[PDB]
A paper describes a structure:
McrBC is a two-component MDRS that in Escherichia coli (Ec) restricts phage DNA and foreign DNA containing methylated cytosines. EcMcrB consists of an N-terminal DNA-binding domain that targets fully or hemi-methylated RMC sites (where R is a purine base and MC is a 4-methyl-, 5-methyl-, or 5-hydroxymethyl-cytosine), and a C-terminal AAA+ (extended ATPases Associated with various cellular Activities) domain that hydrolyzes GTP and oligomerizes into hexamers. Biochemical data suggest that stimulated GTP hydrolysis powers DNA translocation, allowing EcMcrBC complexes bound to distant RMC sites to interact and induce cleavage on both strands. Here, we present cryo-EM structures of an McrB hexamer and McrBC complexes from the evolutionarily distant archaeal species Thermococcus gammatolerans (Tg) and the well-characterized E. coli system.
To overcome this limitation, we produced complexes containing full-length TgMcrC bound to the AAA+ domain of TgMcrB (TgMcrBAAAC) in the presence of GTPγS. This assembly was structurally more homogeneous and allowed us to calculate maps of the “half”-complex at 3.7-Å resolution, as well as a C2-symmetrized map of the entire TgMcrBAAAC tetradecameric complex at 4.2-Å resolution. A TgMcrC dimer bridges two TgMcrBAAA hexamers in this structure, with the scaffold and nuclease domains forming the dimer interface. Structural superposition confirms TgMcrC’s C terminus shares the same fold and identifies Asp340TgMcrC, Asp354TgMcrC, and Lys356TgMcrC as putative catalytic side chains based on their spatial alignment with the EndoMS metal-binding residues. The nuclease domains align in an orientation that resembles the dimer configuration captured in our cryo-EM structures; however, we observe numerous steric clashes in both models. TgMcrC’s scaffold domain and the α12 nuclease helices collide with the DNA substrate. We therefore speculate that our dimeric McrBC structures depict a conformation that is incompatible with DNA cleavage, and that a major conformational change would be required for nuclease activity to proceed unencumbered. In support of this notion, we find GDP at the A/B site in our EcMcrBC structure, the F/A site in the structure of the TgMcrBC complex, and at both sites in the structure of the TgMcrBAAAC complex.
Author numbering:
A (entry chain A): 472 to 584
B (entry chain F): 543 to 584
C (entry chain G), D (entry chain N): 5 to 98, 107 to 280, 290 to 328, 335 to 380, 393 to 453
Amino acid sequence: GNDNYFLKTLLEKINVRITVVKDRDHRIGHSYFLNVETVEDLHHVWYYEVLPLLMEYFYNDWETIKWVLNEKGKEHGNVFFEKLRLTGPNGEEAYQLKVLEGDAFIGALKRII
Amino acid sequence: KGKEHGNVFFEKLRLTGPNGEEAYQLKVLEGDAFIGALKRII
Amino acid sequence: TTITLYEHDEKRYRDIAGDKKAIQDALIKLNKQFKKDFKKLDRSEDNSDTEDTIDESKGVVEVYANKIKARHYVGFAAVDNVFLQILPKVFKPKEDTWEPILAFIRMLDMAYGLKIKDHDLAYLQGRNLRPNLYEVFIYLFAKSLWSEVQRGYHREYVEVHREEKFLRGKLLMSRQIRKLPHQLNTFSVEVHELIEDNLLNRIFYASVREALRRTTWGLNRKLLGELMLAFDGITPIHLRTEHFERVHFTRLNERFRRPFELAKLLFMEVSGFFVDMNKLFERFIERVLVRNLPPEYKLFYQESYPFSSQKPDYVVRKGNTPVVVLDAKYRELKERIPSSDMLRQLYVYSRIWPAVIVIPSSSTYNQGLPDKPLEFEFFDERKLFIVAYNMDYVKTGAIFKADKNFRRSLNNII
Amino acid sequence: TTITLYEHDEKRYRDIAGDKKAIQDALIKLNKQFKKDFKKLDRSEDNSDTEDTIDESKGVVEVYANKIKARHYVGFAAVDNVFLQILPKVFKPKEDTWEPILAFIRMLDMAYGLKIKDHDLAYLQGRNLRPNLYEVFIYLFAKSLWSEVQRGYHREYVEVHREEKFLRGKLLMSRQIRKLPHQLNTFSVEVHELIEDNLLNRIFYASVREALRRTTWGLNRKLLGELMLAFDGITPIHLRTEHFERVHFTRLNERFRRPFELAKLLFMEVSGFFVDMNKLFERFIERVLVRNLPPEYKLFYQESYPFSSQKPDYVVRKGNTPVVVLDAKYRELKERIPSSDMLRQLYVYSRIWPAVIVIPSSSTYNQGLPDKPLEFEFFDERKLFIVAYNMDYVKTGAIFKADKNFRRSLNNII
């Protein structure tokens, strides 16, 4: 989107939402995004190196990770964790991550800013 | 206790969490700002 | 914000603290959380209607457009920095809201089966703290733990087959005979060493860590701060429901029963617990009756099936011959007469058990108070004898003066 | 916006038309209006709890944070361009919402005592109009008025002692003898002239003027437009409750009874009326029983007082000797067994009346349906005989086929 300050404000809008729902020592570093060359490389970094860390730090908790990405209330679309339709025996949310691709992935990454 | 964002050693981040929680952050100071931050501990 | 309710009492959204939108967001999570965890708690003539009412965001609290109304579910819950506590309506007064807290926990002491101490609660009486049910049950957990950790630390014995540079305990021989001489420089022992970080200590390190994060007093922050320093070497765990089941209470950690049951009552999002006010009075009267009825033994929950089984809350029988049915009702009993739903059930409980029936009801300044003796004798045109007994409540204090008055009225009834 | 509810049914605020804030403003006026006018309508085992529940904005509708839930009060109301209609849950289907309207008005025809015509309702069947209870009761008022105004206009006679330039009627003599000759040029008569604008015509001009202002169909706007032209010379009035009481129904305006009772049902802010669904079924079954029980005469609302009087909905006795209690319940009767609140009242009604007791229950596609004969025989360990009878509902149609099946099951019960 012709934004030179994009990957700076991506981790800043993630880390300042990480440090207020978890500790300061659970943030996302900047060695993962230091090797991006194309969008497909950033697609691999955001899905195999950063979002596995957010699923690891937030276990059995799908609402707070939905607020870290500030995508709360938005499900079944261009969302990094779509809502499963099923409810459970007593009722759980129990989301599932969604592998996006192409310009739809950037349309889901633009609204993290 | 009733100070934030100024010459304080622990400043509040301006983005609260989902359930209304707040997280503070250590703030480095220097020069006469740090001495003025020490002269109100007394 | 701290919001407080009495049973069947309402609060205005305009007078209330905090935000109007913030409280209604907290309640819809709590009434939904009560739906998934409804079946763990037992009831008694509750008329719960599990299918429709609880899932319509009316499980614990009835959240309305202009007000917030409490149902007959007593206890507390802390959700989203909106701490809700529901006290019984019987302890409602005419430090101003510190007498009904210690009244409700003492009624939660005798009925529910807890073994807390009265000098644990009398320490807090008069220290002008902010009244809160979560701040006292964290204190009752933290004081009973720090009084059971100050004596002994609960270091329990496990055996480890460890390769040690020294020799401790029994030397394993089948693992040392088959040791090659290039690796002979370490003994292979099986030592019964005492570990400080057992499973009961991993829980109490985690139960304190999730308590100091969510406490608001200045007394509990000092007490849990000393408990967390004593448990400093223990590796932390994430608490589950499997951890609270995997430990068993033997004789060597039996003194840690009192902090653990309170750690299971508060920990397992949501926090706290709720119980039905009808059953908690049905359990509380059962402590009073068996103590106060020497002539005839009384059993609670005896059932006789009509035609769908309608069972009394309590029945007392000396041997087997006298049938004196005692059905505990939390109803206010307005206009000195039982209602349609009450007396219809009293008729069935007497007929399927020449059987007199006594109904105990609450009595304080807030609730409806009759005269001192057995207030209402009734006959249902079948030579029945319905007696309306009323137990006064000195349980707000620490002395049981009304138990003597309840015994004197029951001795005239027996 | 038009919102529709069934009994004990919920609607989402996100899917609903109009505005979220607009509907909740309309309901808090309606539940408050039901509080001041609650005592005019009778109930039957309603468990109303008049002190607390109705004034907490739960009188007719339970307005919640996430949804809107209907209580068991059937009828309709129009408030602030948010027209609410509550149909019974029995007529719920699996023109799609036009069958339960004519089912409910026919159940409002036989039970409540109205004398509407079936060809008044069959005119609307199939004209693809928008289903609305206010649009049909305005039509039932406007058609029954325009069919009773087309024949005669209701010109009623009043006598006036008027000074007329001509001579009409009886000439007053004591007022003409004492007339000075400077004012002899006018007769002083007492003529019994017929006036078109009587009190019943001032009401029907005002009842149409407040109906055409608040109607939404294209059929009622044409019909009330012709009614307002026929009443053009009448001076209008502001309607009150004193006007609907000051008229009396003699033989010369008895044919205007049918439009006036419907004009009193709709007019007297709020509009419409509400009735309890329990009593309306208690009244509707009473029409079915006395028609279907030739061998034994049946009286509704007979009371026998225990010890506070618990009275059956209906009792049938041949002379005085057989005691066959028939208590009408609107309950769904899940799992083919009566509940705790139902069977406890059935036990009292049989004992204070060797008395069998029959409970009639609703039966359609939506409600729980048992088998065709008498479904459930029960004994309450006292040689009792509890029979669960079920009346099928062909009342959505115009033919009474199920009345023959209800008679055949009752003939095996009698």
